[PDB]
Design a protein around this ligand. Structure first.
Ligand SMILES: CC(=O)N[C@@H]1[C@@H](O)[C@H](O[C@@H]2O[C@H](CO)[C@@H](O[C@@H]3O[C@H](CO)[C@@H](O[C@@H]4O[C@H](CO)[C@@H](O)[C@H](O)[C@H]4NC(C)=O)[C@H](O)[C@H]3NC(C)=O)[C@H](O)[C@H]2NC(C)=O)[C@@H](CO)O[C@H]1O
Ligand SMILES: CC(=O)N[C@@H]1[C@@H](O)[C@H](O[C@@H]2O[C@H](CO)[C@@H](O)[C@H](O)[C@H]2NC(C)=O)[C@@H](CO)O[C@H]1O
Ligand code: ZN
Ligand code: ZN
Ligand code: ZN
Ligand code: ZN
Ligand code: ZN
Length: 389
C-alpha cells in the first residue's frame, strides 16, 4: 500500500430494509470496500448467500435487453464504483459471525482447501474484485489455527497463479477479520498470518453487550483501572499482542463500529443493567446515524477512551463511537504505525462532517492510492469482461 487503509464492510443484506446500495457509499473516503458475506459448505465450497443481492438485482440502469451472460446486483454496482474510484479495491468476504461453522471442515483437508481457494477465486475473478477477506469467527484450537494458515497459503498460491495468467503484475489482496479477544487470538498462528496476509482487520469492538453482566465500553482503547467493569476488554492489549506475536503493525487495520450497543435498567457505565432493549434492526444494536437519541447526552470516559450516551430521564446508556473517538483512534493507530481504519458497517454511517468514515479519511490524511484492477478477461460475465464499456 502507499498510505493508510480506510476500509468499510458493505453488507449484501444492507440492500433490503437498510436500503443502502453500493452507489450510496461515499467512495471518495474509502480505500477498500469489503463485500460481506459469502457462505461456506463443509467441503470448502464458497457460495453466494444471496444471488439476487450479489449479481441478479436490476438497478434503474440495468437493462434486460443486454446480450449474453451479465452480472448485475451489487457486483455490477461495485464495479461502477471501482471505475469511478481507481484507488478503491473491492474484496470478497467469506464467512462472518453466522457463517463460520463450516470453516474447520473447509480448512481440514488439502482437497477442501483447494476447493475453497478455487470457488472463492472464481467469484472474485467473475465479479471483478481485487481480493478475498476470510472472516472465520473463529479458530477454536491448534488444528483449526494451523489449517487456517494452510487455507490462506492455498488461497495466496491460487491468487498468484490466477494473476500470472489473467492479471499479470496485479497483486490480489488476501485479508482476515481478526478477533480482539485474547481467548480467541491466543490460538491464532499470528506470525504465519503476519507473513501470508496483506491486512488483518482487527475487529476492535463487541467488548460489551447482552452477553456482559455489566454495562461496558463496546470499543475502548485502554483499560480503566478506576472502573474496570466498564472495560472488560481494551484494543491496546490486543494490538500489542498481534504485533509482538509477529503481525507487522502496518498490516493491522483498526476496526471501528458504526453502531452502538444499548443498555437499559442501568445506573451507568460499569454498573448493573437489565436488557439491551430494542435496536435499529436487531435487539440492543443502534445504527450510528440513529445516535445519539433525542434527549441523551454523550459522556466521555477519558481513561478508557470510549464515548457513550445516557438518558437520565429513561436510564438508557449506549456505547458507540463519535467523530471525536475516530480522531483519537486514528491518532492512536498512527502512533503505533498501524495500517489504517476499518469500519463495520457502511449503511449506519452519517453523511457530511459527522461521517465516521469521512472523519477517519481526514484524520489519516494520506490514504492508500494503489490502483484497483478493471481487467477481468476470464469473467463469465460479458459486462464485467468488457469493464462495463
Ligand atoms: C468481519 C466479521 O467477522 N464481521 C463481524 C460480523 O459478523 C458482525 O456483524 C454481524 O454480521 C452478521 C452476519 O455475520 C449480521 O447478521 C445479519 O443479520 C441481518 C439482520 O439485521 C440479516 O439481514 C436481513 O437479511 C434478509 C435477507 O438475507 C433481508 O431480507 C432483511 O431485510 C435483513 N434484515 C434487515 C433488518 O436488514 C442478515 O441476513 C444477516 N447476515 C447473515 C449472513 O447472517 C449482523 O447484522 C451483523 N451485526 C451487526 C451488529 O452489524 C459485526 C458486528 O457485531 O462484527 C463484524 O466485524
Ligand atoms: C472481545 C470479545 O471476544 N468479545 C466477544 C464478542 O466479540 C462476541 O460478540 C461477537 O463478536 C463478533 C466480533 O468479533 C461479532 O462478529 C458478532 O456480531 C458478535 N456477537 C454478537 C453478540 O453480536 C461475544 C459473543 O456473544 O463474545 C464476547 O466474548
Ligand atoms: Zn424487511
Ligand atoms: Zn434479470
Ligand atoms: Zn504479489
Ligand atoms: Zn501481499
Ligand atoms: Zn484524501
Amino acid at each position: 500500500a502507499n498510505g493508510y487503509a480506510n476500509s468499510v464492510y458493505f453488507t449484501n443484506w444492507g440492500i433490503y430494509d437498510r436500503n443502502f446500495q453500493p452507489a450510496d457509499l461515499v467512495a471518495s473516503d474509502v480505500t477498500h470496500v469489503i463485500y460481506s458475506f459469502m457462505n461456506l459448505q463443509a467441503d470448502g465450497t464458497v457460495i453466494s448467500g444471496d444471488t439476487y443481492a450479489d449479481y441478479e438485482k436490476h438497478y434503474a440502469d440495468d437493462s434486460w435487453n443486454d446480450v449474453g451472460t451479465n452480472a448485475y446486483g451489487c457486483v455490477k454496482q461495485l464495479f461502477k464504483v471501482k471505475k469511478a474510484n481507481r484507488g478503491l479495491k473491492v474484496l470478497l468476504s467469506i464467512g462472518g459471525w453466522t457463517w463460520s461453522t463450516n470453516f474447520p471442515s473447509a480448512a481440514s483437508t488439502d482437497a477442501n482447501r483447494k476447493n475453497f481457494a478455487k470457488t472463492a477465486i472464481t467469484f472474485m475473478k467473475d465479479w471483478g474484485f481485487d481480493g478475498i477477506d476470510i472472516a472465520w469467527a473463529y479458530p477454536a484450537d491448534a488444528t483449526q489455527a494451523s489449517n487456517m494458515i494452510l487455507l490462506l497459503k492455498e488461497v495466496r498460491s491460487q491468487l498468484d497463479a490466477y494473476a500470472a495468467q489473467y492479471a499479470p503484475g496485479y497483486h490480489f489482496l488476501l485479508t482476515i477479520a481478526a478477533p480482539a479477544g485474547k481467548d480467541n487470538y491466543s490460538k491464532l498462528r499470528l506470525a504465519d498470518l503476519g507473513q501470508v496476509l496483506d491486512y488483518i482487520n482487527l475487529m476492535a469492538y463487541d467488548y460489551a453487550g447482552s452477553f456482559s453482566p455489566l454495562t461496558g465500553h463496546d470499543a475502548n482503547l485502554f483499560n480503566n483501572p478506576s472502573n474496570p467493569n466498564a472495560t472488560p476488554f481494551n484494543t491496546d492489549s490486543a494490538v500489542k499482542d498481534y504485533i509482538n506475536g509477529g503481525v507487522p503493525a502496518n498490516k493491522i487495520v483498526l476496526g471501528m463500529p458504526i453502531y452502538g450497543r444499548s443498555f437499559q435498567n442501568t445506573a451507568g457505565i460499569g454498573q448493573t443493567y437489565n436488557g439491551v432493549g430494542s435496536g435499529s434492526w436487531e435487539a440492543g444494536i443502534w445504527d450510528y446515524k440513529a445516535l445519539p437519541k433525542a434527549g441523551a447526552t454523550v459522556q466521555y470516559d477519558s481513561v478508557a477512551k470510549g464515548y457513550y450516551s445516557y438518558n437520565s430521564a429513561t436510564k438508557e446508556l449506549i456505547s458507540f463511537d463519535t467523530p471525536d473517538m475516530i480522531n483519537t483512534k486514528v491518532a492512536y493507530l498512527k502512533s503505533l504505525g498501524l495500517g489504517g481504519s476499518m469500519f463495520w458497517e457502511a449503511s449506519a454511517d452519517k453523511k457530511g462532517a459527522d461521517s465516521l468514515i469521512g472523519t477517519s479519511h481526514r484524520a489519516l490524511g494520506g490514504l492508500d492510492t494503489t490502483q484497483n484492477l478493471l481487467s477481468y478477461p476470464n469473467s463469465k460475465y460479458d459486462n464485467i469482461k468488457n469493464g462495463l464499456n
